[PDB]
Amino acid sequence: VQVLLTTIGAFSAFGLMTIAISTDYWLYTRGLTHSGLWRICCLEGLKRGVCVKINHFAEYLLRVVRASSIFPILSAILLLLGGVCVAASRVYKSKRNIILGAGILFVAAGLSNIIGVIVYISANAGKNHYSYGWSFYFGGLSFILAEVIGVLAVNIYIERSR
Amino acid sequence: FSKPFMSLGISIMIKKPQKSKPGVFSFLDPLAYEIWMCIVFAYIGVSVVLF
Numbered sequence: 295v296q297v298l299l300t301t302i303g304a305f306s307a308f309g310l311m312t313i314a315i316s317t318d319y320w321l322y323t324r325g326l327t328h329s330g331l332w333r334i335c336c337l338e339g340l341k342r343g344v345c346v347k348i349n350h351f352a353e354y355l356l357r358v359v360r361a362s363s364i365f366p367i368l369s370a371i372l373l374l375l376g377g378v379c380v381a382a383s384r385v386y387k388s389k390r391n392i393i394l395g396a397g398i399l400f401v402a403a404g405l406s407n408i409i410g411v412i413v414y415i416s417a418n419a420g421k422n423h424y425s426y427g428w429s430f431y432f433g434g435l436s437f438i439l440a441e442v443i444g445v446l447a448v449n450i451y452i453e454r455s456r
Numbered sequence: 457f458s459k460p461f462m463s464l465g466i467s468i469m470i471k472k473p474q475k476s477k478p479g480v481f482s483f484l485d486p487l488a489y490e491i492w493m494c495i496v497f498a499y500i501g502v503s504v505v506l507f
């Protein structure tokens with residue numbers, strides 16, 4: 295039962311996190327122009343449809359991380375590396391040690407996912423009422439489902455050893 | 457003219473401040489909404505790592 299709830303969760307967390315970083319509908323500011331991750335597409339900006347890329351230019355280390363969004367992407371890279379580790383349960387089975395290697399990547403992506411928001415909120419503010427769009431809440435599901443998949447992958451490793 | 461039957465003067469008129477009833481969640485003011493959510497997500501993150 296739990297052996298199948300992990301492979302379906304890896305493809306439901308990686309395929310869901312790659313969408314949150316793709317569509318640029320994270321933040322809604324004010325004309326009302328919806329924001330994004332790498333570029334914002336303006337609306338009601340003296341033009342019908344305009345979408346231009348943002349220009350970000352020892353505090354310079356935070357600007358490059360916000361521009362080169364590696365933390366919200368590194369979590370997706372670890373989700374696919376862990377998604378193929380649990381896929382190694384059929385081929386080259388009876389190892390009882392490759393499942394533990396997936397429980398580390400499933401939680402290491404959650405640490406790099408919460409960080410990708412701290413560098414995004416601190417750089418956002420750095421009156422004007424701004425809200426979070428539906429595309430920003432998708433990234434939140436990429437962290438909750440990253441912990442349920444991190445408790446279900448290690449629990450199997452404990453049962454296999456016991 | 458007769459004796460003044462009423463005294464007056466140039467006065468100031470400002471908007472009366474209302475009671476300003478605080479919200480139900482007024483105790484969550486010293487920390488922003490982003491801080492409270494980040495604490496919860498860090499709370500579950502530390503717990504899973506500790507397990």
Ligand SMILES: Oc1nc2ccc(-c3c(Cl)cccc3OC(F)(F)F)cc2[nH]1
Pocket residue numbers: 314366407408410411412415430431432433434435436437489490491493494497
């Ligand atoms: O890639 C992403 N990982 C995420 C993890 C959490 C949230 C989030 C949610 Cl789900 C609700 C309310 C505030 C939130 O972010 C906060 F920083 F706490 F303000 C967004 C995320 N996006």
Ligand SMILES: CCCCCCCCCCCC
Pocket residue numbers: 316317
């Ligand atoms: C950035 C260029 C590709 C944009 C793709 C948008 C896909 C939206 C899917 C919405 C699903 C709810």
Ligand SMILES: CCCCCCCCCCCC
Pocket residue numbers: 312332367370371
């Ligand atoms: C400015 C160029 C932006 C290109 C963004 C590519 C995102 C690829 C994500 C792959 C995740 C596995």
Ligand SMILES: CCCCCCCCCC
Pocket residue numbers: 312
């Ligand atoms: C949404 C499906 C994945 C889109 C990206 C594919 C790889 C692009 C590398 C530049």
Ligand SMILES: CCCCCCCCCC
Pocket residue numbers: 484488489492493495496
């Ligand atoms: C401001 C709306 C969210 C409040 C969350 C309070 C969490 C308290 C325990 C961390």
Ligand SMILES: CCCCCCCC
Pocket residue numbers: 441442445449500
């Ligand atoms: C064996 C079930 C573990 C559930 C953990 C949930 C963490 C949010």
Ligand SMILES: CCCCCCCC
Pocket residue numbers: 496
């Ligand atoms: C909108 C935030 C709800 C928080 C409920 C309590 C979480 C521990």
